[PDB]
Amino acid sequence: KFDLPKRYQGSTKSVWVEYIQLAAQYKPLNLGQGFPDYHAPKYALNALAAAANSPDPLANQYTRGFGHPRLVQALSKLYSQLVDRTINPMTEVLVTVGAYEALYATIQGHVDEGDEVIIIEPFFDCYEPMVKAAGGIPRFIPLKPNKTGGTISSADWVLDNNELEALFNEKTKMIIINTPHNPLGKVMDRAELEVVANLCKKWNVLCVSDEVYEHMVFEPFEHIRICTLPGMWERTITIGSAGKTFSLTGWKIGWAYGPEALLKNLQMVHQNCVYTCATPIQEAIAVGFETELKRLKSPECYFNSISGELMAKRDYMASFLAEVGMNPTVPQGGYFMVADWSSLDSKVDLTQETDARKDYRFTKWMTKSVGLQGIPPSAFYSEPNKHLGEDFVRYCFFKKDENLQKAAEILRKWKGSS
Amino acid sequence: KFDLPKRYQGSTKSVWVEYIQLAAQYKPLNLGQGFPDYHAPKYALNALAAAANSPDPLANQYTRGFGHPRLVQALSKLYSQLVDRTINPMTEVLVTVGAYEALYATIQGHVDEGDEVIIIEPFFDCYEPMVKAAGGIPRFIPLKPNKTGGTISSADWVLDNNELEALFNEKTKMIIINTPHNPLGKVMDRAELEVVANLCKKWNVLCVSDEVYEHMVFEPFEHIRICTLPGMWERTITIGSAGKTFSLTGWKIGWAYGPEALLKNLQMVHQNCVYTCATPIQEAIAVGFETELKRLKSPECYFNSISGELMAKRDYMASFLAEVGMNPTVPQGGYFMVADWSSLDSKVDLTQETDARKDYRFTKWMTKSVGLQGIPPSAFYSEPNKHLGEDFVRYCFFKKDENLQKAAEILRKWKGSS
Numbered sequence A, B: 001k002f003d004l005p006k007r008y009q010g011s012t013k014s015v016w017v018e019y020i021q022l023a024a025q026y027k028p029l030n031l032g033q034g035f036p037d038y039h040a041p042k043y044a045l046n047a048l049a050a051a052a053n054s055p056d057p058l059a060n061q062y063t064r065g066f067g068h069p070r071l072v073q074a075l076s077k078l079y080s081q082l083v084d085r086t087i088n089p090m091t092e093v094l095v096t097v098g099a100y101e102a103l104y105a106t107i108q109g110h111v112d113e114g115d116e117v118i119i120i121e122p123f124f125d126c127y128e129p130m131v132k133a134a135g136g137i138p139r140f141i142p143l144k145p146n147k148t149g150g151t152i153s154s155a156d157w158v159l160d161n162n163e164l165e166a167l168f169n170e171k172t173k174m175i176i177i178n179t180p181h182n183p184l185g186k187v188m189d190r191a192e193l194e195v196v197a198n199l200c201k202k203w204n205v206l207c208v209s210d211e212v213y214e215h216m217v218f219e220p221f222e223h224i225r226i227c228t229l230p231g232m233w234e235r236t237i238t239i240g241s242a243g244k245t246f247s248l249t250g251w252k253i254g255w256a257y258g259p260e261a262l263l264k265n266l267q268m269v270h271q272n273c274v275y276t277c278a279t280p281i282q283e284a285i286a287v288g289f290e291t292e293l294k295r296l297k298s299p300e301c302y303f304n305s306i307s308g309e310l311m312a313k314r315d316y317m318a319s320f321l322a323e324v325g326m327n328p329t330v331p332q333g334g335y336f337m338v339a340d341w342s343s344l345d346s347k348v349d350l351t352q353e354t355d356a357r358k359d360y361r362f363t364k365w366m367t368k369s370v371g372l373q374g375i376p377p378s379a380f381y382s383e384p385n386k387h388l389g390e391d392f393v394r395y396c397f398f399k400k401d402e403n404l405q406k407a408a409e410i411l412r413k414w415k416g417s418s
């Protein structure tokens, strides 16, 4: 065989392939997909069909490059109101293949051979490999919970401020923030936003805000975007996804917005990476935004209704998890839940990648033995910090009510309904 | 005023993210670009509507990273019969965001700092910035016509074999061939394939074969896959594109196929660049392939009929270009035609003190003055060899007959039929 692509990371340790194979083999109740197991808003789906059947022959041929005009116009209209700034749809917006390619273009376009990039743990999968492929030097800080009080919220997962400030120096090029957080569901409050913002200003660093779950914060809390804080617009790039916005994860269309000066770099990467994105999908998404745009302050707006929809599911999962004996972290946003398992550790029941990490062991055991699949949070930590995720497990509650209930009956039957 | 030494220098905007703005500004007869003017096969468009409207909720959520299982299976079935070998759909094929991202994954995945990459001029423009971004060192050889003086064939555009072998040394990592060739339309015969194949076998270099136009070769020529030469399968990566195979450039789905050992590198680049490609589009393309797989030898097969559809249009354009004074190169394949325009070629009636490669100026002045697009072939040459393309223009003849007559009319009037 060959070897290394050319001094790469070869992240074949992509948890997803491993767990997809496991689910295929054991067919469990799958709480590990990362997407809804039912249908997305009908208007969006019909929009794609209408684009496919469009009478315009150009509806399915190459579109602009930096973004389908109908789409970038709609995105500028939405985010212009959200950040109270007129965003230039042609120079301050870039459509990319999902938020994923947006991340890639921003790190590939702004991180060079020895640049430091601080990453908050647990991190979304691609953050470290992308940094490393850009030649950058990742610098990790974990979010860690406060275990006292009883109940636990994603708000209780916090950073050490002294550690955080010590991580920043003149070599810091970039910091990647994820709000709402995957998978904790943590929503950064203004104070937390201010801590990062002041650091970025003090050391002149680019702030990359992964805000894919921006519309899913649960009522008590509020999503606040760092690009709105004093002095941050000029040093922030924020990212979103149509997949997350409209629950159409297989559509793989996302975007970055920010000052043209910063977006320029993403453009040079994008243009010689994929050059342009699917035209019928971008048209369908544009009509989806136009639709919501007309009812943005209405409770039936999908941007407003998603949270109510998921909140019931979140409280249900939190409840049955606590039931079985786990301690769930209640998320402030998103559709993932992390819970601390204190069931039979690496005892008679565990014996797998024993060498490896216990959360892998547990999650594969429950799939095989109980028929319930979750994901191991250890996968989202740097090797030296992996032990912080070993007591936990990630579940997704964006699921049909009957499947959530099946999961509850399996845990009850496993536990012993009292 | 920082620097991005990742070699993402210059290239402020590719030719596409320039001329695509000129057309979408002066809205002329768009013969530049590279797409059909009219509807693509209905069975394909129908298949996309069907995927958006599928009762299966997974049809519009995340599919396998390396490619939708249905597409990969169909891709393997097709290419297995053409390459005369069973290709593994799971490890020897990778689905990508057009041939563009396939090319990107291949270069990023196989060329490290200092690797030499041989590119043949004129070349599809992304080859050079891709190898630059990977830290590679491009080496160029131009194709030149055989003492031509008017209407000739793309067959007489040839490279100097002694110049070619001279380029091969122990630093040579890869060579990129494009057949059918953009923008000449050149189809490499067996002898020309054997020449680069022997050099690849002697110098242990990777051959990358861009064959997105594989189904548009005109009689009496035929497309030959270099991966079928004696010992080439182990050292060749072959690329195709659904946008070109099914005339749906807007779908942006391509693929790479070859030995598992070479494909792993690609997988790793893709995984950490975009992770996955649109699911409903991949499904629609899979259904397209399954449709054609049943009538491979029928004249109704789009793989067979497209060249007969294009041939008449090719003949028409060669005639009206020659009637207006140009000396066109009749392509053996594809839907592009380059022609030598002679307004200043031997007449001092024109002179541009400006000094900026004439084909850019001639071609821009047409869309703005006569409402006829076209693109400057100097954009497909390395900086020192650009002058080679200055007396040429590339046109696309994949258009409705009525628009083709429109071009010939604005050309006759422009010159003066009388």
Ligand SMILES: Cc1ncc(COP(=O)(O)O)c(CN)c1O
Residues within 6 Å of the ligand: A034, A097, A098, A099, A100, A101, A124, A178, A182, A210, A212, A240, A241, A242, A243, A244, A249, A252, A253, A254
């Ligand atoms: C934090 C985060 N960032 C980025 C992405 C990527 O989004 P996309 O699927 O649009 O590429 C995800 C996807 N689930 C995500 O959770």
Ligand SMILES: Cc1ncc(COP(=O)(O)O)c(CN)c1O
Residues within 6 Å of the ligand: B034, B097, B098, B099, B100, B101, B124, B178, B182, B210, B212, B240, B241, B242, B243, B244, B249, B252, B253, B254
């Ligand atoms: C030679 C060549 N290679 C690759 C591509 C890109 O293909 P795709 O649009 O499928 O990314 C083109 C596109 N016009 C091309 O001409």
Ligand SMILES: [Br-]
Residues within 6 Å of the ligand: A041, A042, A043
């Ligand atoms: Br609806």
Ligand SMILES: [Br-]
Residues within 6 Å of the ligand: A217, A218, A219, A220, A307, A308, A311
């Ligand atoms: Br809520």
Ligand SMILES: [Br-]
Residues within 6 Å of the ligand: A214, A217, A221, A222, A223
């Ligand atoms: Br909110």
Ligand SMILES: [Br-]
Residues within 6 Å of the ligand: B217, B218, B219, B307, B308, B311
């Ligand atoms: Br023909």
Ligand SMILES: [Br-]
Residues within 6 Å of the ligand: B230, B231, B232, B233, B234, B235
């Ligand atoms: Br071989």
